[PDB]
Design an enzyme around this catalytic site. Structure first.
Site, PDB file in Angstrom:
ATOM      1  N   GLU A  22       0.766  -8.475   0.787  1.00  0.00           N
ATOM      2  CA  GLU A  22       0.934  -6.933   1.257  1.00  0.00           C
ATOM      3  C   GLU A  22       2.456  -6.793   1.537  1.00  0.00           C
ATOM      4  OE1 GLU A  22      -1.418  -4.910   0.922  1.00  0.00           O
ATOM      5  OE2 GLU A  22      -0.445  -3.068   1.865  1.00  0.00           O
TER       6      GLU A  22
ATOM      7  N   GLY B 282       1.232   5.740  10.807  1.00  0.00           N
ATOM      8  CA  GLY B 282       2.589   6.076  10.687  1.00  0.00           C
ATOM      9  C   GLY B 282       3.504   4.784  11.103  1.00  0.00           C
TER      10      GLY B 282
ATOM     11  N   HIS C  61       0.830  -1.083   0.005  1.00  0.00           N
ATOM     12  CA  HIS C  61       0.074  -0.078  -0.033  1.00  0.00           C
ATOM     13  C   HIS C  61       1.027   1.557   0.064  1.00  0.00           C
ATOM     14  CE1 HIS C  61       0.077  -0.485   4.548  1.00  0.00           C
ATOM     15  NE2 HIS C  61       0.066   0.907   4.273  1.00  0.00           N
TER      16      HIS C  61
ATOM     17  N   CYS D  96       3.182   1.693   9.641  1.00  0.00           N
ATOM     18  CA  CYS D  96       3.319   0.922   8.843  1.00  0.00           C
ATOM     19  C   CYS D  96       4.867   0.662   8.088  1.00  0.00           C
ATOM     20  CB  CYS D  96       2.406   0.942   7.628  1.00  0.00           C
ATOM     21  SG  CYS D  96       0.640   0.868   8.222  1.00  0.00           S
TER      22      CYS D  96
END
Ligand code: HHQ
Length: 181
Positions: A72, A146, A41, A148
């Site tokens: 992911e 914040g 992402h 990730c």
């Protein structure tokens, strides 16, 4: 404070960079040579900022499992003039649960941040922001925006990267040795 934080600190000090894309600033784990990982992402393009230096992306691959389900994890090869310390021998070879993990983050918003998240569950399937996702680790800590790309470690193992939360729990994508052969 203890050997968990000791291992986490050793990984942060040598194997992380701050990555900036158009979708924000992320903790980015360097694994070996010029190869690093970031949540998919982050939407990595042809150019990325690495510690505020304009850097060409030589290759980027959004990983999916053999059911063609999102994992992911994006693996990035950076046009960087320096190699990462090779940490592939700290990667687990199988899906597992863990005790006593640390989530470590280093960005402008969260410098030198270490969170003892406790027990980590092999959760498996998660609908992550509406996307079916496999190989998810869960911890019972209320993580925030914040974090990730944050690195999830135990003593002697680098087990995942933080990819989301629901306000009560945090979720990481597994790292496996087989991704980096
Ligand atoms: O879950 C959290 C994260 C942080 I940073 C501060 C407080 N609660």
């Amino acid at each position: 404070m203890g050997p968990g934080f000791d291992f986490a600190q050793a990984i942060m000090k040598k194997n992380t960079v701050i990555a900036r894309t158009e979708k924000g600033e992320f903790t980015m784990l360097g694994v070996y040579d010029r190869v690093a990982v970031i949540p998919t992402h982050a939407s990595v393009g042809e150019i990325i900022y690495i510690n505020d230096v304009e850097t060409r992306v030589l290759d980027a691959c959004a990983l999916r499992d053999l059911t063609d389900t999102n994992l992911e994890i994006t693996i990035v090869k950076l046009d960087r003039n320096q190699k990462f310390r090779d940490i592939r021998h700290f990667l687990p070879r199988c899906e597992d649960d863990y005790n006593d993990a640390v989530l470590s983050v280093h960005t402008s918003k969260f410098p030198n941040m270490y969170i003892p998240v406790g027990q980590v569950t092999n959760y498996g399937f998660l609908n992550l922001g509406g996307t079916p996702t496999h190989r998810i680790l869960m911890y019972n800590f209320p993580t925030r925006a914040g974090q990730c790309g944050g690195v999830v470690t135990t003593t002697g193992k680098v087990i995942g990267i933080h990819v989301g939360g629901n306000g009560a729990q945090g979720f990481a994508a597994m790292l496996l040795h087989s991704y980096f052969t």
